[PDB]
Amino acid sequence: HHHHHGSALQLSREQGITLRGSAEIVAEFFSFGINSILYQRGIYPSETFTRVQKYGLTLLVTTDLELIKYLNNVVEQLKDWLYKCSVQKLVVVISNIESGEVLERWQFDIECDKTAKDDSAPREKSQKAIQDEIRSVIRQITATVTFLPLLEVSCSFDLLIYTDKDLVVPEKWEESGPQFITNSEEVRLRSFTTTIHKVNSMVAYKIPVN
Amino acid sequence: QGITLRGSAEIVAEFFSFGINSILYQRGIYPSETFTRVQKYGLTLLVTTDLELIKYLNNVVEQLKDWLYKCSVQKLVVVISNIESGEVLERWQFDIECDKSQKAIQDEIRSVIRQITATVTFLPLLEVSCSFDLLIYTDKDLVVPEKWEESGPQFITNSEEVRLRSFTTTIHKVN
Amino acid sequence: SWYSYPPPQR
């Protein structure tokens, strides 16, 4: 069972959360989630983004055609894997564009219910209830600015996926390592759950030197 | 044993104000479109842009500074609770280290905000209108008139949909 | 197992 069903009336109209619908919710989140990190940690110029209403907040998403096209491929793929419960982690690695030194690493742990595919009926949780949990995560990600180390140099980012050793991955994806920061500190953030998938967020940064 | 605020009066008050802003924002006591970024001590901070709240906080923060310039206030406790039932939802306790440089301050600020954020990670999702109760734990001796400026400066508000329904300050002598 | 898919080279 579980605890934050949402409005009974809303629920009566929506019916519930199915495995596929959960997969979209979660993939959609990584779309906004990534756009948000890239924007607030200034990985890309701020004039590069544009305002949008989502989750009851005003978020910023990229305007760069190539990036836009890129994230979509990730999202759509992330969507397939989530339906089948194949991806366990999604990591955004941030590093020095020149040296290559990893300076900050955002980690997302995904928990999925293997049995959801055999449900007799949709799970009792409103769309709005799930959005409120997500909005709570995004605000925290924002408040993160005060203590995180400033990223003075020019950075780039990379997307890492962590799954089960029997996944046939597309050509665009290449084998890799965890890419941990050699010496760090980390803060565990809030999570949200669609009652089918659960996402835990956390951020690690290199410990300030000199 | 809550979050520690060590420093000169003027500095501790700042910290408190920054802290409380961060709580209001992160927990959703006030709307996001109500906060803005600002530079301070070389860092970026989130602070409200709502006058009512700004004026009020300012009054209590100033008065706070005065009691602070004489190690008179030991701690500050924020009690968030259901405005309907009165059940207590959470309590933020700040411990004062009234110990009368840039770099140094930064570290203090970063940890206060880091400790606040680390904590929201573990609180339940706040989902009801609430009341904010600031408790100032002083020593036994004051220059407060019958509790103060309304016997504890307060303010009501349903300025639309702003989770915070009322905010009130209250003095309490130790022992 | 880890897999990477890098964004366009800015």
UniProtKB/Swiss-Prot annotation, chain B:
Keywords: Acetylation, Cell cycle, Cell division, Centromere, Chromosome, Cytoplasm, Cytoskeleton, Kinetochore, Mitosis, Nucleus, Phosphoprotein
MF GO annotations: identical protein binding; protein homodimerization activity
Effect of residue 172 to A: Prevents formation of the closed conformation and interaction with CDC20
Broad class of the protein's primary localization: nucleus
Compartmental location: Nucleus; Chromosome, Centromere, Kinetochore; Cytoplasm; Cytoplasm, Cytoskeleton, Spindle pole
Occurrences of domain HORMA (ranges): 6-175
Protein function: Component of the spindle-assembly checkpoint that prevents the onset of anaphase until all chromosomes are properly aligned at the metaphase plate. In the closed conformation (C-MAD2) forms a heterotetrameric complex with MAD1L1 at unattached kinetochores during prometaphase, the complex recruits open conformation molecules of MAD2L1 (O-MAD2) and then promotes the conversion of O-MAD2 to C-MAD2.
Protein name as annotated: Mitotic spindle assembly checkpoint protein MAD2A
Species assigned in the record: Homo sapiens (Human)
Encoding gene (name): MAD2L1
